[PDB]
């Protein structure tokens, strides 16, 4: 199906002494494959998926150089932004950046992204056309003008439409055994009585990949949202994901209720009932 490569960068200033804490992570779809942490002893980009360990020393040297350059850019920005917003030296502040590319089922370019935030709020982002900028406020407007004069969007468009997709396709091939494999959810239902008159049915989906999933309840064949609870999709810790959805029902009426599961790894949606 569709695939993506994304890089996420976070820098957090450290008032009082030294440089910011900087953490960078790379993902293909829902699989982390590289990391850099400024607090770690190696000071190298490090592998986080077995299929990236195929890359030679030139790759690791190059990624380390680039990621360190990224960290210095954020260091400078934190200083610049503190001044733009008239903030004191006493507080910790945060810059976050995300960029990457999406490809369709044919592995050709679909969409590119490059977004930046200061203290958890939008600052500047590349528009969908990869040609212009969305600036949230007047500080970001000054940045927009600087970046327009320096043709930053042109540089990013070249990476996002070219290099990003080329390397995504390489990773998809090299990690085919996992990255191109869908893991269908393993489903079951649990029952609990809260009192003599009320019961909870919980529909579970476990061990699935990718993370995208829909779990819904129906009653007598029609959608039920009232008296339901849906937890956020969560990582199992082994590369797969988990989710559940629950419904409160009158004791004795369990058979009216069906749970419906949709996932890429299922050719047709699944139905569960309390047996």
């Amino acid at each position: 199906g569709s695939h993506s490569m994304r890089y996420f960068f976070t820098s957090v200033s450290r008032p009082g002494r030294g440089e910011p804490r900087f953490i960078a992570v790379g993902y293909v779809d829902d699989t982390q494959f590289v990391r850099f942490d400024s607090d770690a002893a190696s000071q190298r980009m490090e592998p986080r998926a077995p299929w990236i360990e195929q890359e030679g020393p030139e790759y690791w040297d190059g990624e380390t150089r680039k990621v360190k350059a990224h960290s210095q850019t954020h260091r400078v920005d934190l200083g610049t932004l503190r001044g733009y917003y008239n903030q004191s030296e006493a507080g910790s502040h945060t810059v976050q950046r995300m960029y990457g590319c999406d490809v369709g089922s044919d592995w050709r370019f679909l969409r590119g992204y490059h977004q930046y935030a200061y203290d958890g709020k939008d600052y500047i982002a590349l528009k969908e056309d990869l040609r212009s900028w969305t600036a949230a406020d007047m500080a970001a407007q000054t940045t927009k003008h600087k970046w327009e004069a320096a043709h930053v969007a042109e540089q990013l468009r070249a990476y996002l439409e070219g290099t990003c997709v080329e390397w995504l396709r390489r990773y998809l091939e090299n990690g085919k055994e996992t990255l191109q494999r869908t893991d269908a959810p393993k489903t079951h239902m649990t029952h609990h009585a809260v009192s003599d008159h009320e019961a909870t049915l919980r529909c579970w989906a476990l061990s699935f990949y990718p993370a995208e999933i829909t779990l819904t309840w129906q009653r007598d064949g029609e959608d039920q949202t009232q008296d339901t609870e849906l937890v956020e999709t969560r990582p199992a810790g082994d590369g797969t994901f988990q989710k559940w959805v629950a419904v409160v029902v009158p004791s004795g009426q369990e058979q009216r209720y069906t749970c419906h599961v949709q996932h890429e790894g299922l050719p047709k949606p699944l139905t569960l009932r309390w047996e």
């Binding site: 790759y59 990224h70 610049t80 932004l81 960029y99 490059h114 930053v152 540089q155 990476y159």
Partner: peptide, 10 residues
């Protein structure tokens, strides 16, 4: 692979 260019100060 990281972008080599386009990561410039704000």
């Amino acid at each position: 692979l990281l972008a080599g260019i386009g990561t410039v100060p704000i």
